[PDB]
């Protein structure tokens, strides 16, 4: 629904690549089941498409270098309307009442939760400068460094660069990026931040109508 900067861009998918927010036109990303699907629209975390019946669903988009895919084993089912079991909607017939995922992003009753994200470990920050570990946080971003060499290091408030000469191996230090500013969905594939994390509600678009 809109791009990495945060301003409304018509049909564009926005994703996260290793901490950097990137964008790609929505016609460049394809998904499919047993047969190819057609994206109808997208809004926030949600996407509305026409899909045929399949035992799984994959999403693919190709960058200028590499191809990103993701297949999940969620059955997609095609539910005919009435007492004639078709597999593709007919060209002509009679009108019957049905419930379909509407193509509107307006705020109906449904909601999900947006929570405070947990710290995401990044091993690219840690380097070996002079036979000693060096943490170089990204431009204008904190990075909590935890190390278990001689003397435990819990050094949080570093913003520019630090050298922990106590630890001589990169494998015994962990640098966690801190964001604490933009609230992520309460997903189960992300670590949970400490303390109370519920920060708001996101309306669910494309509800059944």
């Amino acid at each position: 629904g809109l791009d990495s900067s945060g301003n409304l861009k018509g049909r564009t998918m926005r994703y996260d690549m290793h901490g950097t927010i990137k964008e790609i036109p929505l016609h460049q990303v394809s998904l499919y089941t047993s047969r190819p699907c057609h994206i109808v629209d997208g809004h926030g975390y949600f996407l509305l498409a026409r899909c045929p019946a399949g035992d799984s669903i994959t999403m693919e988009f190709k960058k200028d270098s590499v191809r990103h895919s993701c297949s999940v084993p969620y059955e997609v089912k095609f539910n005919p309307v009435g007492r004639e079991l078709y597999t593709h909607p007919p060209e002509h017939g009679v009108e019957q009442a049905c419930q379909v995922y509407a193509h509107d992003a307006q705020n109906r009753g449904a909601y999900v939760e947006m929570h405070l994200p947990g710290s995401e470990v990044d091993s690219s920050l840690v380097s070996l400068s002079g036979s000693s570990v060096t943490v170089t946080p990204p431009d204008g971003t904190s990075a909590l460094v935890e190390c278990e060499c001689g003397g435990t290091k819990i050094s949080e408030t570093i913003n520019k660069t630090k050298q922990f000469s106590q630890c001589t191996k990169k494998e015994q230090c962990r640098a966690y990026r801190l964001q604490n500013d933009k609230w992520v969905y309460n997903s189960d594939k992300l670590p949970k931040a400490a303390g109370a994390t519920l920060k708001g509600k996101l309306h669910v678009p494309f509800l059944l109508a």
Partner: antibody, heavy 122, light 108 residues
Framework: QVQLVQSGAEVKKPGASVKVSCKSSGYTFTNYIIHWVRQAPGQRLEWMGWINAGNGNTKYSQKFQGRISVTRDTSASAAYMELSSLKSEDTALYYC???????????????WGQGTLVTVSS | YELTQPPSVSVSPGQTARITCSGDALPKQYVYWYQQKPGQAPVLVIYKDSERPSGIPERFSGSSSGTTVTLTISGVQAEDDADYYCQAADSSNTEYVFGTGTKVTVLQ
């Protein structure tokens, strides 16, 4: 408890190398770095070099090349600093600096030597 | 590359005193403040630009604004007199440099 003690006062005529030894012990010395620095009397400090125990590699100051050399022995856990081609202005106070109580790695040097300021003592 | 620090400052007891330190790439590195007593080795007073080690009175504080790093002392008293040095790594970060030094003194 970090304790480094260096050699006593030694006065010597200009034109030859001076060897000052500072030995450090009382703390985990696997990879900690000890800094040689020279301060003129009543003037700013002038960082000279840094020595790593295990690595045994030193980056010399931009102003001093060749005439400064690094000597270190694990047996005494000591560093030996020799400064050849000494001049009249090169006679100054000397310090060996090292971390004492740890909240980080380098850049946090808390413990220092007593000093080796020297003058005629005949 | 060098750190520009005034030769000395004059402050009366009971009021805050400021020491300024400047560097071209300074907002990219960390500065550390050292207190040198008369005839004594320098002692670190402020590390990581904002905090003070244990045993250092709370009066000392540090602030960073891009090029300018300010060391602030609140309620200056008798034994606060000393030389203050801001030291930090160079742009290449391999070599360390020190400030000129401020002689904080009391006129009365």
């Amino acid at each position: 408890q970090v304790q480094l003690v260096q050699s006593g006062a030694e006065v010597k005529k200009p034109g030859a190398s001076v060897k000052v030894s500072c030995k450090s012990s009382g703390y985990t010395f696997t990879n900690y770095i000890i800094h040689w620095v020279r301060q003129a009397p009543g003037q700013r400090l002038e960082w000279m070099g840094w020595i790593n125990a295990g690595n045994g590699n030193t980056k010399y100051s931009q102003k001093f090349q060749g005439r400064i050399s690094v000597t270190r022995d694990t047996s005494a856990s000591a560093a030996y600093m020799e400064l050849s081609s000494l001049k009249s202005e090169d006679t100054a106070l000397y310090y060996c600096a090292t971390l004492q109580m740890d909240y980080g790695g380098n850049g946090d040097l808390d413990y220092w030597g007593q000093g080796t300021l020297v003058t005629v003592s005949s | 590359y060098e750190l520009t620090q005034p030769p000395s400052v004059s402050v009366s007891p009971g009021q805050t005193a400021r020491i300024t330190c400047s560097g071209d790439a300074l907002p990219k590195q960390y500065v550390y403040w050292y207190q040198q007593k008369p005839g004594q080795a320098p002692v670190l007073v402020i590390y990581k630009d904002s905090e003070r080690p244990s045993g250092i009175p709370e009066r000392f504080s540090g602030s960073s604004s891009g090029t300018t790093v300010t060391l602030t002392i609140s309620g200056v008293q008798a034994e606060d007199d000393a030389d203050y040095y801001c030291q930090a790594a160079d742009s290449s970060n391999t070599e360390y440099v020190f400030g000129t030094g401020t002689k904080v003194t009391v006129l009365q």
